[PDB]
Design a protein around this ligand. Structure first.
Ligand SMILES: [Mg+2]
Ligand SMILES: [Mg+2]
Ligand SMILES: [Mg+2]
Ligand SMILES: [Mg+2]
Ligand SMILES: [Mg+2]
Ligand SMILES: [Mg+2]
Ligand SMILES: [Mg+2]
Ligand SMILES: [Mg+2]
Lengths: 97, 105, 287, 129, 87, 250
């Protein structure tokens, strides 16, 4: 009974809308533009993970360091607690040691 | 006005060597004309453009570099090509009486 | 190429035909199924399955190996020990032969770095380049090379081949600037004055036998004659060489670059060199 | 206070280059370091071994597991299988048996078990690549 | 479609308004002005004279040098007395 | 007057420049107005579909930032008190109503925070990927060189009819040297089309080249790509970012 009795509404995807059509453009901005701009500068998103990657603990540490002062009170409390828990987990628990 | 789409089919002419040597004389003459090296871009373009305009079949960019000699050009223009659909090919390949093929496309 | 011909024969390459190179993508193992499920490879009870086994280095309570060994000053002061990248005469000859280091002009750390003959890391306590006797037997280039340290055999080879070698100190800041001048010029700061060697290194760079940049020039000919006698070659009279001026060109002890003087500002945007004129600034930058 | 001048030659001298210079022409080869320019015209063989950007033969030692010693001829263009045959013929007398090799056609590389970098470099210099 | 204009570095020097509280402090000091001069040259609009130390800064630097970097003569004298004592 | 282009960059002594037909969009039948020599190391390299895949996946992923986040049992509202005592109730032991087990509880191992998938392939690898893409297009007869992108009219119907007549693909990626100088005619023609996309030379990328069936280039764009991609070959290892001044790098 966890299965729907009717076909879901047809899903139409426009493979040639502007976003899909122009996806990937300027990814070679650096090599093809005298390296004036690094491709990582094309990444639009959270300030603390623009052209940067890491595990959950590293991401939380970076978030607190970069925007922690501008975070809401309860969100910052949650971030501090998550950092604490992730520290304990990564530094004290696991199969390999 | 867009001209009607050209058919990709091309059957090599019977007077292929005569036509090609006439074009070679027009563009460039010496003995063993089949070995005239097409290293000069001007002459290569002249010969290939004349051949394409005449025969309706042009050398693709992928084969343009390997067409190094008039012999290579002759080989490319004597190998034929057909553009009939797969349906036409299968139906004209002498289908046995018990094999029926239909397209719903 | 046959590969390109096969492409011509094959369908179009699109985003629906791409495949990673076999062996580049290992399958991901996740704990579902008979083989990888149940205890999920963690074992049975104990600390290991609970994921609470003691820290690395713990030996169950027995005094750890890394703690029962006495402390010894193996790495005492490692961050304060000076490091000099080696530059073998083999490497120098290779660079000269390939034209990455021009022997017709005075060769120094900037030129070596530009030619990519050596990679200096001032942040890692590198203090410059040391000449190394390796390749001395087959070294034939005549060059005026300035380094930080030099071996007796390396000096002998350079001088035998008609070249000139001088050992010049570079404190960490000057070393960074000389290794990477363009970033410094983009910093916009006036060119600083190279600092003198620390007291421990002063006797080294004030010694003629080491061809120190602060040694008495009158003592150089005697040392060169001693090396020539010791290593059995005739000392070439470079004063008669057509490149004698280039061989003799040595930057001032307080000068980082050859022509540029301390205190100048290199405006690279408009190709200019602003030189201070205030008397106090000139006195400081000439000090 | 300020005084601008045009002595930018000493700054141009410090400016580093980005393109590897073509090796200077020497009257005699091989050079004191042993380098030798590729022979011109190129050797007429089914394959071609392009030099590295440094103008050196693309033969490199490699080691895996701490005991698997290998030598890789990397920048091969043409008949990598002809190159494999030639390398096997060249190395069998030295090694004592036909060398074991992998011919990565896609990468155009030849990987031989064992360290033969110097011998292969000398052999390729003789072949003229 | 047509691609949007390619991204480009903001041409010319960028001078944040000091009044704004959100402007980072490192973009307001003399070091930022010197960097702008070095990069964009005379178009920076910063007086070249500010690049060199002001007289008080020069006095501080000279005092620091006298304090921490001894002269060659002093170094040689210290080495000589050390060698004499050791001998 | 044929438009004959020669390779400006040096060609390896063992390789011969590949050749292509220089075309023009000024007319339907203008399918051969010149002959262009393209550098072999750019347009006749090894078909490394593995590198094509690497670069395509890099382009797809390195910009990705998944914004999926779930509340852990610590972040779910409430769940501080013990639901009931350890012993005597006859029920399962629990410490909070928001543990992963409970309805409405936290997610044990869920998507955590906005995660970045940023990673950079070596610039040499990405340049080689561009080269391989160009070689694949040329070898499969999807690359069409042009003298210029000037159209007789801005009508999209003309461009579509020209592509159909020349037997181009359903999708055409047109490339011009710089964004500013792109002809107004082609700008208007491609602004209204969906499968015909006009990009500057600096915007060329493997993902778009693969998404579009045919790739239309101009002679200056060809020269631009040749120079930019060949520099990576024979460039030094960087001393500092190439944005900073160099002795000979523009
Ligand atoms: Mg089992
Ligand atoms: Mg159990
Ligand atoms: Mg147990
Ligand atoms: Mg005990
Ligand atoms: Mg390895
Ligand atoms: Mg709670
Ligand atoms: Mg509890
Ligand atoms: Mg919920």
């Amino acid at each position: 009974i966890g299965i729907r009795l009717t076909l879901p509404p047809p899903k139409v995807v426009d493979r040639w809308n502007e976003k899909r059509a122009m996806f990937g453009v300027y990814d070679n901005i650096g090599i093809l533009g005298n390296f004036e701009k690094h491709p990582k500068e094309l990444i639009r998103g959270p300030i603390w993970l623009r052209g940067w990657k890491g595990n959950e603990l590293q991401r939380c540490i970076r978030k607190r360091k970069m925007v922690g002062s501008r975070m809401f009170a309860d969100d910052l409390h949650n971030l501090n607690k998550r950092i604490r828990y992730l520290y304990k987990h990564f530094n004290r628990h696991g199969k390999f040691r | 006005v867009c001209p009607p789409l050209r058919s990709r089919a091309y059957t090599p002419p019977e007077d292929l060597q005569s036509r090609l040597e006439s074009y070679v004389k027009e563009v460039f003459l010496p003995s063993n004309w089949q070995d005239i090296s097409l290293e000069d871009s001007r002459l290569k373009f002249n010969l290939l453009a004349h051949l394409a305009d005449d025969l309706g079949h042009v050398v693709p960019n992928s084969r343009l570099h390997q067409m190094c000699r008039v012999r290579d050009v002759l080989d490319f223009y004597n190998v034929p090509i057909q553009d009939r659909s797969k349906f036409d090919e299968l139906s004209a390949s002498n289908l046995p009486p018990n094999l029926k093929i239909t397209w719903s496309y | 190429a046959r590969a390109l011909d096969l492409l011509r024969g094959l369908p179009r390459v699109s985003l629906a035909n791409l495949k990673p190179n076999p062996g580049s993508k290992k399958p991901e193992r996740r704990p579902r199924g008979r083989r990888r499920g149940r205890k999920c490879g963690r074992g049975h009870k104990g600390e290991r399955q609970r994921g609470t086994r003691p820290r690395l280095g713990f030996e169950g309570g027995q005094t750890p190996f890394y703690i029962r060994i006495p402390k010894y000053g193996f790495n005492e002061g490692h961050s304060f020990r000076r490091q000099y990248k080696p530059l073998s005469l083999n490497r120098l000859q290779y660079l000269i032969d390939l034209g990455r280091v021009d022997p017709s002009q005075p060769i120094d750390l900037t030129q070596l770095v530009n030619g990519r003959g050596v990679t200096i890391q001032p942040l890692k306590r590198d203090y410059g380049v040391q000449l190394v006797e390796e390749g001395a037997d087959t070294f034939t280039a005549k060059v005026n090379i300035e380094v930080q340290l030099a071996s007796e055999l390396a000096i002998a080879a350079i001088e035998k081949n008609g070249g000139v070698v001088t050992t010049a100190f570079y404190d960490p800041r000057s070393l960074d600037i000389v290794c990477k001048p363009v970033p410094f010029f983009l910093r916009g700061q006036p060119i600083p004055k190279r600092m003198l060697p620390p007291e421990e290194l002063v006797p080294y760079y004030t010694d003629a036998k080491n061809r120190g940049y602060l040694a008495d020039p009158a003592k150089f000919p005697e040392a060169r004659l001693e090396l020539a006698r010791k290593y059995g070659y005739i000392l070439p009279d470079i004063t008669k060489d057509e490149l004698f001026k280039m061989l003799c060109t040595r930057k001032d002890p307080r000068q980082i670059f050859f022509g540029l003087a301390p205190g100048w500002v290199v405006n690279m945007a408009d190709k200019k060199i602003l030189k201070p004129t205030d008397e106090n600034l000139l006195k400081y930058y000439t000090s | 206070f300020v005084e601008s001048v045009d002595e930018y030659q000493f700054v141009e001298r410090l400016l580093p280059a980005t393109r590897i210079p073509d090796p200077p022409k020497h009257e005699h080869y091989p050079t004191p370091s042993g380098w030798q320019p590729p022979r011109d015209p190129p050797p007429n063989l089914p394959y071609f071994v392009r030099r590295s950007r440094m103008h050196n033969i693309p033969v490199y030692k490699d080691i895996t597991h701490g005991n698997r010693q290998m030598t890789v001829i990397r920048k091969v263009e043409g008949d990598i299988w002809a190159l494999q045959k030639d390398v096997e013929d060249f190395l069998s007398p030295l090694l004592g048996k036909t060398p074991v090799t992998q011919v990565n056609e896609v990468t155009g590389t030849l990987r031989i078990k064992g360290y033969f970098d110097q011998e292969l470099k000398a052999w390729l210099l003789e072949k003229g690549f | 479609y047509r691609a949007r204009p390619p991204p480009r570095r903001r041409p010319g020097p960028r001078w944040p308004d000091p009044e704004d509280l959100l402007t980072p402090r490192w973009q307001l000091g003399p070091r930022y002005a010197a960097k702008q001069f070095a990069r964009y040259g005379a178009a920076s609009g910063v007086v070249p004279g500010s690049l060199w130390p002001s007289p008080e800064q020069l006095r501080e630097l000279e005092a620091e040098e006298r304090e921490w970097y001894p002269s060659l003569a002093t170094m040689q004298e210290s080495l000589r007395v050390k060698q004499l004592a050791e001998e | 007057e044929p438009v004959l282009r020669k390779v400006e960059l040096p060609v390896p002594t063992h390789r011969r420049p590949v050749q292509a037909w220089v075309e023009s969009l000024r007319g339907f039948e203008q399918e051969r107005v010149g002959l262009a020599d393209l550098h072999p190391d750019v347009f006749a390299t090894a078909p490394r579909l593995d590198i094509l895949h690497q670069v395509a996946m890099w382009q797809k992923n390195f910009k990705r930032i998944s914004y999926a986040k779930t509340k852990t049992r610590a972040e779910v509202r409430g769940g501080g008190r013990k639901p009931w005592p350890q012993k005597g109730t006859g029920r399962a032991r629990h410490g909070s109503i928001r543990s992963p087990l409970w309805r409405g509880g936290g997610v044990a191992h869920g998507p955590r925070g906005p995660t970045s998938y940023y990673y950079m392939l070596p610039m040499k690898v990405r340049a080689l990927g561009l080269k391989v893409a160009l070689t694949v297009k040329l070898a499969q007869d999807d690359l069409h060189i042009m003298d210029s992108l000037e159209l007789p009219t801005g009508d999209p119907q003309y461009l579509t009819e020209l592509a159909h007549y020349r037997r181009w693909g359903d999708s055409v990626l047109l490339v011009d040297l710089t964004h500013e100088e792109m002809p107004q005619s082609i700008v208007e023609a491609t602004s209204r089309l969906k499968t015909f996309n006009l990009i500057p030379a600096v915007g060329l990328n493997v993902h778009s080249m693969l998404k579009h069936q045919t790739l239309v280039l101009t002679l200056p764009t060809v020269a631009f790509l040749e120079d930019k991609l060949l520099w990576q070959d024979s460039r030094y290892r960087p001393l500092y970012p190439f944005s900073l001044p160099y002795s000979d790098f523009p």
